[model samples]
Target: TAITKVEREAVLVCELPSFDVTDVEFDLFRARESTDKPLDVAAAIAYRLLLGSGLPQKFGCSDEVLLNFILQCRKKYRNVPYHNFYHVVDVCQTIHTFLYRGNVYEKLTELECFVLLITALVHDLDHMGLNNSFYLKTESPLGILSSASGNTSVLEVHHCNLAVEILSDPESDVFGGLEGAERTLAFRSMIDCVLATDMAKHGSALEAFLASAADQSSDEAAFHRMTMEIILKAGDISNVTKPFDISRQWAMAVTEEFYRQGDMEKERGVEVLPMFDRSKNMELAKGQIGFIDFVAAPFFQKIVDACLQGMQWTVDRIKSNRAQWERVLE
Candidate 1:
């Protein structure tokens, strides 16, 4: 189909480079200070750790490149149509500040610190803004994409790899000075962390981590588990902490995406879950609590049991969200 002038204009505007990309990660860190919300708290800390541990390892990822990449993502991603970019940043920050802030888990050694923050930022790079149900219901590319691809865990992996296509280009400020080893490890750490954030991987990651710490004390497992849990969960529910108006805007964007899936469900004759509802995610609220109760709470309760300040802080968030949603059903 031939593209219309209006559609072309829209794309052109969308393609323009971002000045917000000019805003360093530190700006986000400073901006996040006012809010004690779970997502805000976590993102602030993630920025500090990202520079402290991860940046030194990545070759071309200067403050300019890093911030610019974030800016590029924000601009290229259409927030009005879908909730992809904000959600990614939201998740990264939420995971960071909630788990890593105030040296809350200051006892964690270097490798863990490195893994936690890298995992958060690179977790969701290119989001097309569609949901799994749409693919599954209509048997769309996404459904086949996730199922037939065999690299379901590799979605984020491929995205990070493709990032080089941009970062390596002469135009990319971020990839300027990277050498062989630094580039290799930077991608490696980022890939491992990003793929690990998929909802499909949650149960297996828990089991695998438990197996790692099985011989270790419960307290050890708990702390490690909580760190990663918020790391993942923060990525999972990242958009709620924005200034209310902006947050609502993000919510509407996601809801519009959900509405598309709902339309698909109706077309394909499948049952639409509450999360697919444009009105409210009542069923999702129940399920989210159940997940927290069975998976997240137990996992993190033990993490904080070791005095991980972030764990205690995160528990309140989960509980609070659970209550907020549950009241709506009544």
Candidate 2:
């Protein structure tokens, strides 16, 4: 709740001299390497992106409160390889491209757009670099709680809980100005979008969104909610759609994180998938090609074909990156 003056000053000092935060080709790795205080720089990027969208002002969010919210999110992220603050900042940046550059903004209202951006920051709060299956397989406390409650989304639920806790304080509440129905919609959509990020639910979420987009007579409210969910989901899996270098960097970080999880699971006598097994020494090119062929290519292709025509670049980039990986294999 209490964002210190020192913390605020850290972000305020980042000027981001030459970087354009809105570009679809924005280089987050360069931004990270550009400063000693990468955390502050990442925080500033999120702040700048939110403010640049002209979303905060429309929703009555003051610069100070928005900075406070960004700092709050920064504090919650662990020092994980993949699910760290930088990853969420990347997601925030990528979603900006989807909405504004990709013209997906026309499908939703201003409030929904604002909610999606803010939700990206809180989507993976307090992540420990481990997947939900790790928790369930180890019978960890969060896993037990989730299983007993009949909910499979252990981490997403925890993230939403912390997000609500942060917003409970007026100083960090980005949605503080909304009243009654608007506020309810903001919170509901944020939580729903976070839950939809779970890969376990990926198939169902994509199916529901595609079905809604196909029907012209679909319920407007349901359609809007699903679109928000689909956009966030797309951003979450958007690594393969990045340029080759950036996409490779992200893949390396994710691979290291998965191997770490696998190491822990071995120590705990739980199952470790072959993809995560460090002993397997899998080639990065093949793993990426498999992901593109089986996961990313299909998801982006179907969504762009169904509704997000403006985002054809994502599909194109995925194909280009896949070819680069195949070249490496050759």
Candidate 3:
């Protein structure tokens, strides 16, 4: 079997010093530097992160199987502006920082932390580059199915399903060595974390998390689950927490995607929000400023101040980015 062949060769030829096993921010720079082989790059970044975490060895995961899992998950992402492999890998790296730098791992087990990292890699698997609102507004078949299935987070559920499909392959299952109750917890935690990424769940998710962390009497299992969920949510929207150049790049990607969706809405004769309308000439700074003022800044501040005090850098970076964007607006 050629299972380990790619992993072996990747270690030889795909290795970049800047992207070496230790630096957690390697994915952002790699995405910027090379457009040649994002799939390989993404896989390598994930490989290094897991390698550094030492989670695979602890769980008795085969290198080939984990590499295969990453590559398989990579193939599932659509080449959308924001929801692509680059974005997801970026999320994975960001979540890595949240776990290690934010000191979030203190509240979670090694297996729980591993599941969080792995979940980030597949949370948006097979995204169609369209949002849940797009599906529902268009009343597409997916929307109907989402409704019929009684799932509010339609895309999230679909992503979890695709993730399960990829993991169904024993050769590609990173958790192949685990079974019974531990395996069940891993899958359940991963699914819950993925579902929490839905922006529709954002408010309740943040609120519930705050409540739980504040209550000393909160159940251990519930609090831990919410922590996993919040970290993933934090990672998903963590762009503003990065250096300005990188943050701006991500904002551009998301803005372009929103505009494209707006364009489609117009063609379909559906009402478009001003934020999404390509015709409105929404300046990147204005949009970003609004987002920071209302969403990113507040959320990061609340979460970081609550328990992730080590992540105050994120809040600081958000404020800094907001100021930079203000200059752009001026």
Candidate 4:
């Protein structure tokens, strides 16, 4: 409560009055060349997208509370190479385009859309820069907690915990105004979307999502949950769907992070996944091509075909990027 009071006052002094709030390509906006701090840029992106989504106006979410929440979330993200604040906000911006331009929001409510955007921002909160497999393989404390709880989404569960903690502060509770089922849906949807981002749960998640999308008579709530999960997954893997330079930038960040993990595995005597083998002298082009063929390409294709035909451009871009990588391979 005291922290909430302090954050309330801090919010009065932390405004993005000068930062360009224009709807622009997030990759360029957060380019390494930008002078703005990553945290500031992320907060600005969250601000623009949240207010622009029209959810705040429709649902009476206070701008001040939302801003504080974004800032608080930005603080929680560790400076990990891939799963940092920049990555989460990139998801926020990517999902913004999906909802507003690609028309996916038509199938979702303002509240549901709001939950999706907020979930994107907080999904990876306070990530330790390591993944679930790392925790499980090492049998670390978090890994033990995950096993004890009987949930395989270790890091995802941790992120959800941190997100709930962030929301507990009334000064940062963006959904504080809502009560009853509306409030319950907000929390439940946000938690589900974040948990669904776990790659370990990938196949089953996608299968369930596609099944629901194909069923014209499926429950509305189930459809919405699956849709939210799929969109977050899309945003998480969206790098290849962007222009080449931007996509390349993301690839480098994630690859380096993987290599670091591989280096750690080496010291700890863990069986390293090929993609994470730091000493393997892996060719970036070839690895990326494999990733596209086996992972990004089909995921985007299936989701687009299922219901998000408006996002066919993502599938197209993945193919285009794969071709570019092929050139590098040559």
Best by TM-score: 2
Consecutive 10-residue window with the lowest summed lDDT within model 1: 15-24
Residues 1-330 of candidate 2: C-alpha lDDT, one tens digit per residue: 499999999899999988999999999999999999999999999999999999999999999999999999999999999999999999999999999999999999999999999999999999999999998888897689998989999999999999999999999999998999999999999999999999999999999999999983748888899999999999999999998999999999999999999999899888999999999996899899999999999999999999999999999999999999989886
TM-score of each prediction: 0.62, 0.99, 0.95, 0.92
lDDT of 4 by residue, 1-330 (tens): 333555444434435444443332446434434544545545666777788778876777788778888888888888788888888888888888898778999989888888888899899988877788999899998789888978988988889999999999888888898899999999998998898899988999999989999994758779888999999998898988988878888888899889988889999999899889877886888888888999999999999999999998898888998999988877
Give the candidate order by descending lDDT. Answer: 2, 3, 4, 1
Clashing pairs in 1: 21-71, 41-97, 42-93, 42-97, 42-98, 43-93, 222-302, 222-303, 223-303
User: How many clashes show up per model?
Assistant: 9, 0, 0, 0
How many Å off is the CA of 218 in candidate 2?
3.0
In the range 78-127, model 1's lDDT, one tens digit per residue, is: 34355455455556555555544535446454445544554455455565
> lDDT of all the models against the reference?
0.50, 0.95, 0.84, 0.82
By lDDT, the better pick of 1 and 4 is 4
Model 1 lDDT, full chain set: 0.50
* Cα error, candidate 3, residue 72 (Å): 0.3
